[PDB]
Design a protein around this ligand. Structure first.
Ligand code: 3PE
Ligand code: 3PE
Ligand code: 3PE
Ligand code: 3PE
Ligand code: 3PE
Ligand code: 3PE
Ligand code: LFA
Ligand code: LFA
Ligand code: LFA
Ligand code: LFA
Lengths: 296, 101, 100, 480, 162, 311
C-alpha cells in the first residue's frame, strides 16, 4: 500500500539490502566501469518514475535540479523542482548522497570504538551526538555516572549547542544576503573551539565522552576560557540581532515563509525549534530530563 | 574650429583605444594558455518598460526646455504625468505589475 | 553639404528592404521585424526631410513615429505570443481559415 | 500658436472623451464593475455629444497648428460619437457572456472615439497620422478581444500586420511630401509650386503612398483584401465600430486633405482616384454575389459604398455640392450600417465562449424575431439605394455630383454596382423572410433593439423626407 | 560628417539586407540592432541629435530589448522553418524582389527630381524639439500619451497568461 | 608642427590618459573591493602578493590570461564572445562624458546624460546576450530575471536624472556641474538623488540587486572589469550630477572629484557588505510602485519651483 516504495539511501540499480546481517559491510572494489555507467545515468537523467505528474501539460512546467552539489555546509542533496514560472508545483527530493553506513558500522565496531562514529552523525553537534549513545550504553551496562560527570557532559553539550546555533544563524543570515555576521559568528565559534580544544584536544569531533564518564579530567585553566567566552558572547549576539536579525529586508525574506502549525509539526515528526515555534512546549531536557539537567 | 575638432578626435581615439583594448584582451586570452518556456510576466514587464520609456522620452524633451515653455507647458506636462500615473495605478491595481499573484 | 536626395534614397532603400523581408518570410516574428524596419525607414526619411528644411518638425514626427512603433511592436509581440501559445507554431499560412 | 480658453471651449469633445478615458481607467483600477464602467463610458460619450452644442456656439477657429474646428468637424465628430455610443450599447450584451475582463472594451472604444474626433478636427499631417493610429490600435485590441476564439485572433493578426504596413506606407508618403514642401499643414501641400508645375514628382509619390495607406484604411481596391476576413473574425460590436466610425473619420480627414491641399486638384491624382473608385465599386459589388456569411457580405458592401464616397470625393474641385453629398451619404450609410451590424450583434449576443461557432443563420429570422427582421431588411434595402430609404438619397447625391462634373465612367460604374448590390441585398432580405428548419431579456438588449429600431425609423423617415438632414448637413460647412 | 553619413548608411543597408535573409532570430536581431546604431549615426551626421539619442535609447534600447525578450521566451532554436529554408529558394523570393526593385526605381526617380539645396547638418538641439513639442504640438503629445496607453492596455489584455 | 595640431594631440593624449586611468581604477577597485570587504569584515584581505597585496591584480590578470579559453560546443560563438565586449565598452563609453576637471573631458556633448542612457540600454543587451548564448537553462533563466530587474529600474533612471536636467536647463555635463556653483544638487534634488542611486545600483547588478556560470578565462575577467568600470562610471556620474563634480572650496578640482568618487565607491562596498538581498517580487514592486511615481512627482515639483522662481 505504499504510494512510491523506492530506494532512498542507495541508487535504484543496487543489488541487495545493506542492513541485513548477510550483507558484506566493507567497501567493494572500485571499478571505473561502474563510474562510467553511473556517469551515463547522470547524463541521460522521465518525470513519471519519481511519482511526479503533469509532465509539462501547461507548457510552462519548467524542471530544474537544485542539487546535488551545494555551495553550503548542510551537505549534498538533490531536489527536482517543477515550477509554473517561479511557483513550485511539485518537488521530489532525492537523498542518500551522504550515506555512510553508520548503523552497519555500529554492528562492526565495539561499544567503545564506535564513539568517533557517533561524533560524525551530525557534524555540527559533536558531544551532543556523543551524549545519547553513551547514555544508552550506560543503560545497557548498568552504570550510574556521578554528578560531576553529568555536569561536565552538560557543559560540553551546551558549548557545542552554542557553536551549532551560531553556525545556523550565520548560515541563515548569509542565505538572506548579509555576509558579515558569518565572519563574526565564526570568530565566536573560534573562541568556543579554543575552549573545546583545551578541554578535549580537538575542535569539531572531540570523541571525548566515554562509557561511564569522560576521557580525561578538566585541564587546569578551563574556567578562564569559559569566563572569556561568557564575557565575549552576549555583546556579539546583540550586535548580530541589531545588524541583521532586525533588518526589515531580512524580515520580509523570512516572515510568513514556509509556515506550519502544531498539527503539521505533529504529523511530520518535526522536533526542536520547528516544533516549539508552533506553541508545543516539548523539550527533552524538561519533559524527560537526562544527565542531570534538573539541576540547571 | 580647433577645440571642437580636437574634442571630436579625442572622442574618436577614445572609442578606438577602448575597442582595441577589449579586442586585445580577448585575443590574448584566446592565444595564451595550454589546452586539454517562460511565463508572460517577462513580456509584460518589458512591454511596460517600453511604453513608460517612450513616455519618459516625452518628459526628457520637456525637461530641458522648462523655462522657455512657461506655465502653459507645466500644465500640459502635468496632464501628461497625470495620465502616466493613472495608467500606472491601473497597472498596479489589476495585478499586472505584481510578479506573484 | 549632404544632398537631401541621398538621404531620401537611403531611407527608400531601407523601406523596400523592410517590405521585402515582410513579404518573403512566413515567420511572424520576421514580419514584425520587417514592420519595424519599414517604420524606422519612414522615420529616417522624415528626419532627413526635417534636417533639410532646418525644422524640429522632422524630429517631432520621428518621436510620434517611434511611439507608434513601440506600441505596434507591443501589440504584435503580444499577438505572436498568443499565437505561439494556442498553436505552437509561428507559420502564418496555418492562420488562413477565413477565405472566399 | 498657443492655447486659449476659447480654444479650450472648441476643444470640448476631445477633452471630455480623454477625461472619460482617465475616469474609466481609474474606475477599473478601483473595482472591476462592468455596468458602472459601461455607464461611465456612455455618459462621457453623451457629454461630448452634448458639448458639440457649446463648440458650435464658440464658432469655427484653428485650435492648434494641428487642429481646426468648424461645422464639418462638428458633423463628423457627431457621427463618430454616435457610432461609438452604438458600439457600446451593442457591446454590453455581447460582453455579458465574455468570461475574461469586460471593462477594457469600453476603454478601447473611448480611445478610438478620441482618435476619430482628432481625425474630424485634423488640419495637419501630424494630427492625421496620430488620429489614424489612435483609431487603428484600439481596433487591434477590439478585433482580437476574444483572442481565445481562433477566428478573432486570426483577424487581429491580419489587421495588425496589414495596418502597421499601411501606417508605414502613409508615414513614408508624408515624409516625401514634407521633403518636397517643407510645411506639414494641409493648406501648404503644394503651395510652393506655380505656373502649372503642380505635378511635382516627389509630391505625387508622397501623395501616392499616402493614398496607399488611406485606401487600406478605407478598404479601397486594391488595398481591400483585409476587409471580409477582419469583419468576420472580429466581434460584431467591433465590426459595427470598424465599419462605421473608422471609415467615417478617415474619409472625413481625406475630404479635408483633398479640399485644403493645393495639390488636391491635380489631374494625375484625380485619374488615379477615379481608377480606384471604379475598381472599388465594381470589385466590392462582384465579390458579394456569392457570399453566405453576412459579415463578409457587409465587408464587400463597405468596399462598394466607400467607392461611391470616393466618386463623390473626386468631384470636389469641379463641383460645389460634393462635401454636402459626402455628409448626407455618410449619415445614411452610418445609420444603415449601424442597423445591420446591430441586428448581427443582437443575434450574436451573448458571446457563447471561444469554442461555439458564431454563425449568424439569418434565414427565417422573421418567424422568431420579427422586429429585428424588419429592421434588418430596411437596412438591406437602404444599402441598395432603393427609395423610401436614406441610402437612396445618398446614392442620388453621388449621382448628381458625378453628373455635374461629367464623371461618366464613375456614373456608369455606380449604376452597374448598384444593380449587383440590388441582387445580393435583396437575396439577404428574402432569405430573412423565408422559412427556417429549426429555431438576453435584460434592458440592455432592449436598448440595443431600440437603437436599431430608431435607426430603421430614421432611415425610412429621412428617405421619405430628407430635407432636415440636407439642411443640417449644409449648416456644417468648413472654412473655405 | 559626410563620410560618417555614407559609411553609416552603407552599414545600415548591409545590416538590413543581412536581417531579411538570415535564418537565426537572435542573429537577425543583432544585425538589426547594428542597423539601428548605424541609422542613429546617420541622424547624428545630419544634426538631428535628439532623434539619434532616442534611436539608441528607445529603438535600439527598448523595442528590440522587447524583441530579444520574446525570442528567448519562445526558445526559438530554428525549428520547422530553419529545416525548410524556403525563402532562399528562387521561386519564393525573386517575385517580391522584382516588386521591391520596381518600387525602389519609381521612388528613386521621384526623389531625383526635387529641388535640393543640400543638408547643412546644423545641429538641432533637443531644447528646440522640446519647445516645439510643447508649443505648436501640444495635442500631439497628449494624444500620443493616449495612444501609448491604448497600446499598453491592448498588449496587457492579449499577452496575459491565465 | 602647428599650435592647432599641438592642441589636437594634447586633447587626444588627455582622452587616452582618462581612459587608462578609469580602466586601471576599475581593476584596482576590484582589488579594493576585496580589501575593503576585508576591512569591514574584521580581517585583512589580500596582503601577501607584493606590498599590501598591490600585486594581487597582476596575479589574477596572469591567471586569467594563461587559462584555457573555453567556448561551449553547442553554443553561439559570436554572441558568447560579444557579451563581455558589450559589458565592457558600454559603461566605458558611459564614462566617456564625465568631466573630471575643467578642461579634462573626453567629449563635451550636447546630449551627455542621454549618451549615458544609450550606454545603459546597451549594457542590458550585454546581459541578455550572455544569458542566451550560454545554451544553459539556469543561465537563461537568470538572465531573464536580471534583465527584468534592469528594465524595471531603467524605466526611471532617466526620470530620476530629469530633475537635475530641469534645473540646469541643459543636457550638457559641464552645464550641469556649472549649475551647482553655489548649492550642490543633492540638496534640491534629494529624491532624484536617492532614486538615481537605487537605479544605478540596480542597473550595475550590484548588491543587493544581484548567468555567469558558463563564462571562464578572459571573458569572465572582462565581465568583472566591465562591472567595476560601471561602478566607477555611476559613482562619477552621481558626483557630477548631485555633488558638483570638480567644484570645491580649498582643494584642487581633481582632489575634490576624486575624493567624492572614492567616497561613493566605498559606499558601494559598504552597501554590499551591509544590506541583505530582498526578494524578486518586492524588488520589482519597489521599482515600479514606489520609485517611478516618486521621480514623476519630483520632476513636477522641480518644474513648479523653477517656474515660480523665474521672475
Ligand atoms: C554610486 C552609486 C552607489 C551609491 C551607494 C549608496 C546608495 C545605495 C542605494 C542602495 C539601494 C537599495 C534599495 C533596496 C530596496 C529594497 C526594497 C524592498 O524589496 O523592500 C521590501 C521590504 C519588505 O517589504 P514587505 O512588503 O514588508 O514584504 C513582506 C514580505 N514578507 O521593505 C522594506 O524593508 C522597507 C524599506 C525598503 C527600502 C527603502 C530604501 C532603502 C535604500 C537603501 C538604504 C540607503 C541608505 C543610505 C545609503 C547612502 C546613500 C548615499
Ligand atoms: C494620479 C492618479 C492616481 C491617484 C492616486 C492613487 C493612489 C493609489 C491608489 C490605491 O488604491 O493604491 C493602493 C494599492 C494597493 O496595492 P494593490 O496590490 O494594487 O492592491 C490590490 C488589492 N488591494 O497600491 C498601489 O496602487 C501602489 C502605489 C501605486 C502608486 C502610483 C502613483 C499614484 C500617484 C502618486
Ligand atoms: C573604418 C572602416 C569601418 C570600420 C567599422 C565601422 C565603424 C563605424 C564607422 C561609421 C561611424 C564613424 C565615422 C567616423 C566619424 C569620425 C568623426 C567625424 O567625422 O565627425 C564629424 C561630425 C562631427 O559633427 P560636426 O560638428 O558636424 O562636424 C563638422 C566639423 N566642423 O560627426 C557627426 O556629425 C556624427 C558622426 C557619426 C555619429 C557618431 C558615430 C556613430 C557610430 C555608429 C556605429 C554603428 C555600428 C557599426 C558596426 C560596424 C560593424 C558591422
Ligand atoms: C564591437 C564594436 C562595435 C562597433 C563600435 C563602434 C565602432 C566605431 C567607433 C569609432 C567611431 C568614430 C568616433 C565617433 C564620432 C565622434 C564625433 C561625434 O560623434 O561627433 C558628433 C557629435 C558631436 O557633438 P558636439 O561636438 O558636442 O556638438 C557641437 C557641434 N558639432 O557627437 C555625437 O553625436 C555623439 C553621439 C554619438 C556617439 C556614438 C558612440 C558609439 C556608439 C556605439 C557603441 C557600440 C557599442 C558596442 C556594440 C553594442 C551592441 C550592438
Ligand atoms: C566635507 C565636505 C565639505 C563640502 C563643502 C562644499 O560643498 O562646498 C562647496 C559649496 C560652498 O559654497 P560656494 O560659494 O560654492 O563656495 C566655493 C568656494 N570656491 O557648498 C555647496 O555647494 C553646498 C554643498 C552641500 C552638500 C551637503 C552634503 C555633503 C555631504 C555629506 C555626507 C554625504 C553622505 C551621503 C549622502 C547623504 C545625503 C546627503
Ligand atoms: C501621498 C501621495 C504622494 C505625495 C508626494 C510624494 C512624493 C514627494 C516628492 C517631492 C519632491 C520634491 C522636490 C523639490 C525640488 C524643488 C527644488 C528645486 O528644484 O529648486 C530649484 C532651484 C534652483 O533652480 P534655479 O534657481 O533656476 O537655478 C538653477 C541654475 N541655473 O533650487 C534652489 O534654489 C535650491 C532649493 C533648495 C530646497 C531644499 C529643500 C527642499 C528639497 C529637499 C527635500 C528634502 C527632504 C528630506 C526627507 C523628508 C522626509 C521624507
Ligand atoms: C421600405 C418599405 C418597407 C419595407 C419592408 C420593411 C419590413 C416590414 C415587415 C412587416 C411584416 C412582414 C410580414 C411578411 C409575412 C410573409 C408571409 C408569407 C406567407 C406565405
Ligand atoms: C462595368 C461598368 C461600365 C461603365 C461604362 C460607362 C461608360 C461611360 C462612357 C463615357 C464616355 C465619355 C466620352 C466623352
Ligand atoms: C500559400 C500562399 C502563398 C502566397 C504567396 C504570395 C506571393 C506573391 C508574389 C507576387 C509577385 C509579383 C511580381 C511582380 C508582378 C508584376 C508587377 C506588379 C503588377 C503590375
Ligand atoms: C575615478 C577617477 C578617474 C579619473 C580619470 C581622469 C584622469 C586624468 C588625469 C589628469 C591629471 C591632471 C589633472 C589636471 C591638474 C589638476 C590636478 C593636479 C594634481 C593631480
Amino acid at each position: 500500500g505504499h504510494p512510491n516504495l523506492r530506494r532512498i539511501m542507495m541508487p535504484q540499480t543496487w543489488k541487495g539490502h545493506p542492513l541485513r546481517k548477510d550483507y558484506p559491510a566493507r567497501a567493494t572494489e572500485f571499478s571505473p566501469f561502474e563510474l562510467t555507467k553511473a556517469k551515463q545515468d547522470l547524463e541521460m537523467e522521465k518525470p513519471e518514475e519519481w511519482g511526479m505528474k503533469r509532465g509539462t501539460e501547461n507548457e510552462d512546467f519548467m524542471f530544474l535540479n537544485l542539487g546535488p552539489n551545494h555551495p553550503s555546509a548542510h551537505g549534498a542533496f538533490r531536489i527536482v523542482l517543477q515550477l509554473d514560472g517561479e511557483e513550485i508545483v511539485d518537488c521530489v527530493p532525492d537523498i542518500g548522497y551522504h550515506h555512510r553506513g553508520a548503523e552497519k558500522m555500529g554492528e562492526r565496531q565495539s561499544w567503545h570504538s564506535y564513539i568517533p562514529y557517533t561524533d560524525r552523525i551530525e557534524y555540527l553537534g559533536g558531544c551532543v551526538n556523543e551524549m545519547p549513545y553513551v547514555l544508552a550504553v550506560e543503560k545497557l551496562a548498568g552504570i550510574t555516572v556521578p554528578d560531576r560527570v553529568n555536569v561536565i557532559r552538560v557543559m560540553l553539550s551546551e558549548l557545542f549547542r552554542i557553536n551549532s546555533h551560531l553556525l545556523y544563524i550565520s548560515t541563515f543570515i548569509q542565505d538572506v544576503g548579509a555576509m558579515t555576521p558569518v565572519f563574526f559568528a565564526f570568530t565566536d565559534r573560534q573562541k568556543i573551539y579554543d575552549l573545546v580544544e583545551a578541554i578535549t584536544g580537538f575542535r569539531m569531533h572531540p570523541a571525548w565522552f566515554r562509557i561511564g564518564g569522560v576521557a580525561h579530567d578538566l585541564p587546569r585553566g578551563w574556567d578562564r576560557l569559559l569566563r572569556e567566552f561568557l564575557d565575549w558572547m552576549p555583546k556579539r549576539l546583540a550586535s548580530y540581532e541589531k545588524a541583521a536579525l532586525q533588518n526589515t529586508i531580512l524580515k520580509g525574506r523570512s516572515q510568513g515563509v514556509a509556515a506550519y502549525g502544531a498539527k503539521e509539526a505533529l504529523e511530520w515528526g518535526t522536533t526542536g525549534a520547528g516544533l516549539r515555534a508552533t506553541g508545543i512546549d516539548f523539550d527533552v531536557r524538561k519533559a524527560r530530563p537526562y544527565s542531570g539537567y534538573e539541576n540547571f | 574650429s580647433t577645440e571642437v575638432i580636437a574634442h571630436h578626435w579625442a572622442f574618436a581615439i577614445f572609442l578606438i583605444v577602448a575597442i582595441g583594448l577589449c579586442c586585445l584582451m580577448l585575443v590574448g586570452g584566446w592565444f595564451l594558455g595550454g589546452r586539454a518556456r517562460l511565463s508572460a510576466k517577462f513580456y509584460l514587464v518589458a512591454m511596460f518598460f517600453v511604453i513608460f520609456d517612450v513616455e519618459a522620452l516625452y518628459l526628457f524633451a520637456w525637461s530641458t526646455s522648462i523655462r522657455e515653455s512657461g506655465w502653459v507647458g507645466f500644465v500640459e506636462a502635468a496632464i501628461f504625468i497625470f495620465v502616466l500615473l493613472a495608467g500606472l495605478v491601473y497597472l498596479v491595481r489589476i495585478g499586472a505589475l505584481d510578479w506573484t499573484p | 553639404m549632404i544632398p537631401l536626395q541621398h538621404g531620401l534614397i537611403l531611407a527608400a532603400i531601407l523601406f523596400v528592404l523592410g517590405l521585402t523581408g515582410l513579404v518573403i518570410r512566413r515567420n511572424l516574428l520576421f514580419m514584425l521585424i520587417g514592420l519595424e524596419i519599414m517604420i524606422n525607414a519612414s522615420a529616417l526619411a522624415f528626419v532627413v526631410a526635417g534636417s533639410y528644411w532646418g525644422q524640429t518638425d522632422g524630429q517631432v514626427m520621428y518621436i510620434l513615429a517611434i511611439s507608434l512603433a513601440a506600441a505596434e511592436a507591443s501589440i504584435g509581440l503580444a499577438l505572436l505570443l498568443q499565437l505561439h501559445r494556442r498553436r505552437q507554431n509561428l507559420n502564418i499560412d496555418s492562420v488562413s481559415e477565413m477565405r472566399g | 500658436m498657443t492655447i486659449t480658453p476659447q480654444n479650450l471651449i472648441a476643444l470640448l469633445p476631445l477633452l471630455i472623451v480623454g477625461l472619460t478615458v482617465v475616469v474609466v481607467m481609474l474606475s477599473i483600477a478601483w473595482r472591476r464593475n462592468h455596468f458602472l464602467n459601461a455607464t461611465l463610458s456612455v455618459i462621457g460619450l453623451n457629454a461630448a455629444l452634448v458639448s458639440l452644442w457649446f463648440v458650435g456656439q464658440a464658432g469655427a477657429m484653428d485650435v492648434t497648428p494641428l487642429m481646426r474646428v468648424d461645422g464639418f468637424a462638428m458633423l463628423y465628430t457627431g457621427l463618430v460619437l454616435l457610432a461609438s455610443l452604438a458600439t457600446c450599447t451593442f457591446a454590453y450584451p455581447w460582453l455579458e457572456g465574455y468570461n475574461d475582463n469586460k471593462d477594457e472594451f469600453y476603454l478601447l472604444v473611448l480611445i478610438a472615439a478620441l482618435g476619430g474626433i482628432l481625425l474630424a478636427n485634423a488640419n495637419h499631417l501630424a494630427s492625421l497620422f496620430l488620429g489614424i493610429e489612435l483609431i487603428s490600435l484600439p481596433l487591434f485590441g477590439l478585433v482580437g478581444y476574444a483572442f481565445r476564439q481562433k477566428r478573432s485572433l486570426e483577424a487581429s493578426i491580419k489587421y495588425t500586420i496589414l495596418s502597421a504596413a499601411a501606417s508605414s506606407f502613409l508615414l513614408f508618403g508624408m515624409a516625401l511630401v514634407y521633403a518636397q514642401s517643407g510645411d506639414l499643414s494641409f493648406v501648404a501641400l503644394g503651395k510652393n509650386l506655380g505656373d502649372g508645375m503642380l505635378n511635382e514628382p516627389l509630391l505625387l509619390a508622397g501623395f501616392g503612398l499616402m493614398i496607399v495607406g488611406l485606401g487600406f484604411k478605407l478598404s479601397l481596391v486594391p488595398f481591400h483584401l483585409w476587409t471580409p476576413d477582419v469583419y468576420q473574425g472580429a466581434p460584431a460590436p467591433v465590426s459595427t465600430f470598424l465599419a462605421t466610425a473608422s471609415k467615417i473619420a478617415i474619409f472625413g480627414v481625406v475630404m479635408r486633405l483633398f479640399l485644403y491641399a493645393p495639390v488636391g486638384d491635380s489631374e494625375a491624382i484625380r485619374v488615379v482616384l477615379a481608377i480606384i473608385a471604379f475598381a472599388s465599386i465594381i470589385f466590392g459589388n462582384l465579390m458579394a454575389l456569392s457570399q453566405t456569411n453576412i459579415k463578409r457580405l457587409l465587408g464587400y458592401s463597405s468596399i462598394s459604398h466607400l467607392g461611391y464616397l470616393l466618386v463623390a470625393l473626386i468631384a470636389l474641385q469641379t463641383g460645389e455640392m460634393s462635401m454636402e453629398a459626402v455628409g448626407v451619404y455618410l449619415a445614411g450609410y452610418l445609420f444603415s450600417s449601424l442597423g445591420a451590424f446591430g441586428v448581427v450583434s443582437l443575434m450574436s449576443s451573448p458571446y457563447r465562449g471561444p469554442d461555439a461557432d458564431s454563425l449568424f443563420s439569418y434565414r427565417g429570422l422573421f418567424w422568431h424575431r420579427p422586429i429585428l427582421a424588419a429592421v434588418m431588411t430596411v437596412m438591406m434595402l437602404s444599402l441598395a439605394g432603393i427609395p423610401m430609404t436614406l441610402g437612396f438619397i445618398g446614392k442620388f447625391y453621388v449621382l448628381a455630383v458625378g453628373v455635374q462634373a461629367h464623371l461618366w465612367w464613375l456614373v456608369g460604374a455606380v449604376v452597374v454596382g448598384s444593380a449587383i448590390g440590388l441582387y445580393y441585398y435583396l437575396r439577404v432580405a428574402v432569405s430573412l423572410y423565408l422559412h427556417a428548419p429549426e429555431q438576453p431579456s435584460n434592458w440592455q438588449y432592449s436598448a440595443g433593439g431600440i437603437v436599431v429600431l430608431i435607426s430603421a425609423l430614421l432611415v425610412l423617415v429621412l428617405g421619405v423626407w430628407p430635407q432636415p438632414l440636407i439642411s443640417i448637413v449644409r449648416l456644417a460647412m468648413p472654412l473655405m | 560628417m559626410e563620410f560618417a553619413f555614407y559609411i553609416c548608411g552603407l552599414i545600415a543597408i548591409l545590416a538590413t539586407l543581412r536581417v531579411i535573409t538570415h535564418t537565426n532570430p537572435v542573429h537577425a536581431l543583432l544585425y538589426l540592432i547594428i542597423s539601428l546604431l548605424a541609422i542613429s549615426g546617420v541622424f547624428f551626421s545630419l544634426g538631428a541629435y535628439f532623434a539619434g539619442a532616442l534611436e539608441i535609447i528607445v529603438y535600439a534600447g527598448a523595442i528590440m530589448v522587447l524583441f530579444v525578450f520574446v525570442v528567448m521566451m519562445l526558445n526559438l532554436g530554428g525549428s520547422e522553418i530553419e529545416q525548410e529554408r524556403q525563402w532562399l529558394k528562387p521561386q519564393v523570393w525573386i517575385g517580391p524582389a522584382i516588386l521591391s526593385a520596381i518600387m525602389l526605381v519609381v521612388i528613386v526617380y521621384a526623389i531625383l527630381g526635387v529641388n535640393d539645396q543640400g543638408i547643412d547638418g546644423t545641429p538641432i538641439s533637443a531644447k528646440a524639439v522640446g519647445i516645439t513639442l510643447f508649443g505648436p504640438y501640444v495635442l500631439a503629445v497628449e494624444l500620443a500619451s493616449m495612444l501609448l496607453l491604448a497600446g499598453l492596455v491592448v498588449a496587457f489584455h492579449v499577452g496575459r497568461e491565465e | 608642427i602647428s599650435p592647432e595640431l599641438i592642441e589636437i594631440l594634447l586633447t587626444i593624449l588627455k582622452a587616452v590618459v582618462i581612459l587608462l586611468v578609469v580602466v586601471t581604477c576599475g581593476a584596482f577597485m576590484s582589488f579594493g573591493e576585496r580589501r575593503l570587504l576585508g576591512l569591514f569584515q574584521n580581517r585583512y584581505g589580500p596582503n601577501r602578493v607584493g606590498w599590501g597585496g598591490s600585486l594581487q591584480l597582476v596575479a589574477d590578470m596572469i591567471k586569467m590570461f594563461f587559462k584555457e579559453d573555453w567556448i561551449p560546443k553547442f553554443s553561439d560563438r559570436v554572441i558568447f564572445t560579444l557579451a563581455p565586449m558589450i559589458a565592457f565598452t558600454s559603461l566605458l563609453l558611459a564614462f566617456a562624458i564625465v568631466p573630471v576637471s575643467p578642461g579634462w573631458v573626453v567629449a563635451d556633448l550636447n546630449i551627455g546624460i542621454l549618451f549615458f542612457l544609450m550606454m545603459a540600454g546597451l549594457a542590458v543587451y550585454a546581459v541578455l546576450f550572455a544569458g542566451w548564448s550560454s545554451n544553459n537553462k539556469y543561465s537563461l533563466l537568470g538572465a531573464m530575471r536580471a534583465s527584468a530587474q534592469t528594465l524595471s529600474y531603467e524605466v526611471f533612471l532617466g526620470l530620476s536624472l530629469m530633475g537635475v536636467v530641469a534645473q540646469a536647463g541643459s543636457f550638457n555635463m559641464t552645464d550641469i556641474v556649472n549649475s551647482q556653483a553655489h548649492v550642490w544638487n543633492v540638496i534640491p534634488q534629494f529624491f532624484g538623488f536617492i532614486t538615481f542611486a537605487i537605479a544605478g545600483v540596480a542597473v550595475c547588478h550590484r548588491h543587493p540587486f544581484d548567468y555567469h556560470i558558463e563564462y571562464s578565462g578572459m571573458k569572465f575577467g572582462l565581465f568583472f572589469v566591465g562591472e567595476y568600470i560601471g561602478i566607477v562610471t555611476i559613482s562619477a556620474l552621481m558626483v557630477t550630477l548631485f555633488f558638483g563634480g570638480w567644484q570645491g572650496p580649498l582643494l584642487p578640482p581633481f582632489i575634490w572629484f576624486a575624493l567624492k568618487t572614492a567616497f561613493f565607491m566605498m559606499m558601494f562596498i559598504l552597501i554590499r557588505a551591509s544590506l541583505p538581498r530582498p526578494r524578486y517580487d518586492q524588488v520589482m514592486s519597489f521599482g515600479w510602485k514606489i520609485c517611478l511615481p516618486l521621480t514623476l512627482i519630483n520632476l513636477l515639483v522641480t518644474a513648479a519651483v523653477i517656474l515660480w522662481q523665474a521672475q
